[PDB]
Amino acid sequence: MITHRPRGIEHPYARSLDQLYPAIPIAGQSLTIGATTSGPCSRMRCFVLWPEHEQVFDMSPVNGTDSDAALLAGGEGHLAAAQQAALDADNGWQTSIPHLPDQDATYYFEALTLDGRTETSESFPLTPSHWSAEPVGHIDIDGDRFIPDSPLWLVSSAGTHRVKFALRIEGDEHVVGFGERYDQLDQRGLRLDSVVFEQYKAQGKHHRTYLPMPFAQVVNEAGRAWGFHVETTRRTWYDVAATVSDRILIEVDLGFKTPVVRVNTWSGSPTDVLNGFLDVAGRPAEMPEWIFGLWASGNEWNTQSLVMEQMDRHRNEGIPVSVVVIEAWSDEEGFTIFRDARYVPNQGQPHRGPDFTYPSDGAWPDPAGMIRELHERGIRVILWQIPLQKTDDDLGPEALAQGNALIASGHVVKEPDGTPYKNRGWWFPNALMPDLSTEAGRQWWTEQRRYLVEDLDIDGFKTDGGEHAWGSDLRYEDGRRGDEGNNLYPVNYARAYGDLLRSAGKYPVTFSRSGFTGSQAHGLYWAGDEDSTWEAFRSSITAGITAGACGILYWGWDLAGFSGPVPEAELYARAFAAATFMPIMQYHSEFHHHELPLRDRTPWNVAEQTGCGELIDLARHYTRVREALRPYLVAQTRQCLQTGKPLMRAMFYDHADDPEIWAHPRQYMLGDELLINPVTAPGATTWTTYLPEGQWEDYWSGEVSEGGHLVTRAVGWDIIPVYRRVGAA
């Protein structure tokens, strides 16, 4: 059998061997044509039927490019020569047309198998596009930066596929936004895009993100700002004065109708602009004070005994924790039932607490007892989730019935033919994806988990993933196709679990890595997966500041990285100090098959593996600081909800009339009063901070400094440079 899918697998940054490239053909440019055969073949030809002419291309056998092959397996973080996968079972064939005629056509493929059978594909349409300056559609945009003759519309006989247009930027302006970004604060000079994607590690090196938004603010050096928001959940691209040094070129994917693109715009102070966006996107929710203590997490805490051992160690060491996340809690099949729990089969109906008996010798002999006892100690409990339903052939009967009930409910993301979407990604491959686009779909999925909250009394969810939907033509029950619904997915996912919690009398404490416009209203966020490196530490600071600048208020990260051997002692020290002055303070460790040595990011395990015993005393010190900061974090957060400002706050919000702030993009304000400057280089014994105008007090020594100047500070491991505004007497 011959496979050709014009758009391919629809990984946002990679091509498969069975597609057109570009996926939307452009007249006068090259067109690469790919197809695969299920069996081995001696020949493949592409027949292209033009109105007056017919042409036959002899295709050549090909392998994926080094870049494309890598990306389809989850990228370079999932790849090493040390672990060699088998070769591709598919047999790619390829040809190209160097200068595509502007004529509509049809094409098909013909293969000769090794045993002598002729296989022939279906017929496919070829409708080349061209860029038109005719008023095919309309950009609905106010303000003074839109260049009115700039719109170009990508049109074919089929319709209108994309639009590009430009906004004017001035010589002293800086561009901050586009959601959570890992590379740099000021995006001027860069080309980027806004598509939800799972980049496993090194997000800053690859210029991608889990949490994009089609929004940015533009700030001058006099302190005035404007901003823009392309009001869409389709993919957008930005050339931020890279190609033309005074133009932001914006390209927008369109539907599958007279196209109208709405662009919201604002001007005023930087705060005015962000508030404008928040009025459209949604605003952060009120949260309980316990979110501001230390969060403890470790994927290898997979028994009640292992969790409680770590909670007892925190207590015995005097390093208090406010939250424990448990990831490996479930049967690892349905993510609904604690591992080893016994119960009567349900036909995939929701369970209640009394359905379960917990063996005394099982991994979780009394999960309700764990939660009650942790609650008595002032510790809240968060459980991990994924918006996927496994369909492995080796699942037990309960998980199989749950998947059949999901499909049978109708509440599943669908392929264009109506059958269920099977995950195209590398993680949880071929899993079903629940349709969380309507109230009924969100309720169906979360009702399966309701007993965890109502009967077991858990306090929230780590709503991991959400980036899994690839396919512009997927179908959602809200009426959207994938080209709109796929970026929206993580917003609906976080919302679904927030609503479960609210319905059960609790705060909507969800903890997610992915999102889009609207994510501001739905819980807490962390910066995703990274290595334990200095570069990742720097990237994570950038991620928090940029996420803050788009209204993601309750942000944190895996301090010192979660992946690989434990961080070196010095990195753990500097990162732990920095994390103390960020919105959510949390340590975490990646799954390691319970191999040796232990990879927990606990202060004691890191101290043990590094031979650096003083790390436990350091964690005591900074956790005391964190506890003392709680009233400040609570009050400043309340203020942030009224003002619209970030908590982890770029300098331009309060000091945009000072041009020197842009030379120090990894210092930031924590609320109104504290200026933070993490120490991000190994071997540093001093560290320099730019202070803006006003008087500033050293957090540690009380020493007063005049603002408008650089200052230098000795930085032993017990110091992170922090300056407090000097108030009126």
Ligand SMILES: OC[C@H]1O[C@H](OC[C@H]2O[C@H](O)[C@H](O)[C@@H](O)[C@@H]2O)[C@H](O)[C@@H](O)[C@@H]1O
């Ligand atoms: O990118 C998908 C997924 O990758 C990790 O989980 C799977 C697995 O990845 C590698 O094989 C590592 O060596 C293992 O330790 C991991 O368990 C990430 O942990 C996960 O967050 C991510 O979504």
Ligand SMILES: *[C@@H]1O[C@H](CO[C@H]2O[C@H](CO)[C@@H](O)[C@H](O)[C@H]2O)[C@@H](O)[C@H](O)[C@H]1O
């Ligand atoms: C999301 O993924 C990681 C957790 O995934 C691992 O653990 C779950 C639960 O035991 C397994 O089902 C899964 O196969 C594993 O990969 C988090 O540790 C990480 O922080 C995150 O980004």
Ligand SMILES: [Ca+2]
């Ligand atoms: Ca390679």
Ligand SMILES: [Ca+2]
């Ligand atoms: Ca690698």
Ligand SMILES: [Ca+2]
């Ligand atoms: Ca023959």
Ligand SMILES: [Ca+2]
């Ligand atoms: Ca025009």
Ligand SMILES: [Ca+2]
């Ligand atoms: Ca589209």
Ligand SMILES: [Ca+2]
């Ligand atoms: Ca039952």
Ligand SMILES: [Ca+2]
């Ligand atoms: Ca099998």
Ligand SMILES: [Ca+2]
């Ligand atoms: Ca590593």
